């Protein structure tokens, strides 16, 4: 909810994204619909920073953050860990199915 409330509002409807998480395409198209407001916020904050250092730091952070290729996807970064995190829940469901086939 804290990760999504900056995009989808305050009535973020967290159940819909818990059940069905966002595809990487929807992560792209949700990084692209606030990029104008993000760049205007970064310009209004780099103008009002107390240092040219801090102004360069906030414009560099927005330069490396607004790029949608820089979203860290754990499924791309660590494939084996993501499939093991899948099998951690598939194994619990398999234990329930083994109990139901024993019954």
């Amino acid at each position: 909810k804290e990760e999504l409330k900056v995009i989808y509002g305050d009535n973020v409807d967290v159940k819909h994204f818990q059940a069905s998480p966002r595809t990487p395409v929807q992560q792209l198209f949700d990084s692209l619909k606030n990029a104008a407001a993000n760049k205007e916020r970064a310009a209004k904050e780099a103008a009002a920073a107390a240092s040219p250092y801090l102004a360069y730091a906030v414009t560099k952070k927005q330069e490396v953050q607004a790029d949608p290729s820089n979203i860290p996807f754990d499924e791309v970064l660590y494939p084996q860990l993501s499939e093991e995190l899948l099998e951690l829940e598939l194994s619990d469901i398999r234990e329930d199915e083994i109990a139901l086939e024993k019954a």
Partner: protein, 257 residues
């Protein structure tokens, strides 16, 4: 403190390259299910002389004892791995990069073209080591197709044509390790993984519904004993089962007349 940090980093590198020499999965050894003994002789509750309310405490004692044994087996594994990587963190390389801090000499002052490059070294660590090349559509290409859609008079669906092009590029977004494309790298996303979990979960839940459908079609009296209060009725011998629901189960079983 710097030596302790360097020792800890040599220890983490030792952990990684002796976890990759065995090539083992990452979550295999942090999961205490993998250290759980599945083939233990599984104590029979009927040979322990329980009273009525004493059977779920017996089940809780057996389950928690076996879980504590699994956790202790996990801990003994990690004590063995800790000594195995303490033996390899000693004979190491210890050529790590240093923390980028701005250049400040003794009498001199720092320049902003060095603070800015250490900020660039900080923001260069915010890119991921392997990323999807998600193609953002530039304005110069979405407009070069938007005026083309405006040439044939379909300019009101021209934004639709542009976003369909952007989505069609986004679905086949290829991965990028260091600028170069890892060809043939296949990944399974998080939405696809949760869809797989949802379908497998729904099929096991309908097997639960089918199980209880048979057991309540044949003997529908079972609905009067609630599921949380079921093995609170049990005992070791059948004559020790608590008679709270026994008479009602016998009288509901004879039907509606």
């Amino acid at each position: 403190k710097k030596q302790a940090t360097e020792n800890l980093m040599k220890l983490l590198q030792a952990y990684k390259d002796i976890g990759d020499a065995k090539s083992e999965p990452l979550l295999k050894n942090h999961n205490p299910r993998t250290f759980e003994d599945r083939d233990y002789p599984v104590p029979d509750f009927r040979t322990q002389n329980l009273k009525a309310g004493d059977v779920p405490k017996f089940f809780d004692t057996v389950i928690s004892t076996r879980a504590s044994a699994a956790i202790a087996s996990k801990d003994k594994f990690w004590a063995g791995r800790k000594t195995e990587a303490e033996a390899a963190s000693a004979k190491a390389s210890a050529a790590f990069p240093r923390v980028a801090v701005p250049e400040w000499k003794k009498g001199k002052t720092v320049s902003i073209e060095n603070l800015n490059t250490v900020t660039d070294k900080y923001a260069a660590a915010l890119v991921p080591k392997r990323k999807l090349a998600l193609p953002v559509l530039p304005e110069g290409v979405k407009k070069a197709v938007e005026d083309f859609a405006a040439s044939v008079g379909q300019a009101k669906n021209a934004s639709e044509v542009s976003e369909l092009l952007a989505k069609s590029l986004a679905e086949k977004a290829v991965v990028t390790e260091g600028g170069k494309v890892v060809e043939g790298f296949s990944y399974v996303s998080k939405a696809v993984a949760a869809k797989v979990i949802a379908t497998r979960r729904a099929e096991v839940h309908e097997r639960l519904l089918k199980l209880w459908a048979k057991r309540l079609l044949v003997s529908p009296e079972l609905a009067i004993v609630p599921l949380n209060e079921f093995d609170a009725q049990l005992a070791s011998k059948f004559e020790g089962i608590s008679p709270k629901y026994q008479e009602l189960l016998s009288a509901v079983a004879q039907g509606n007349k």
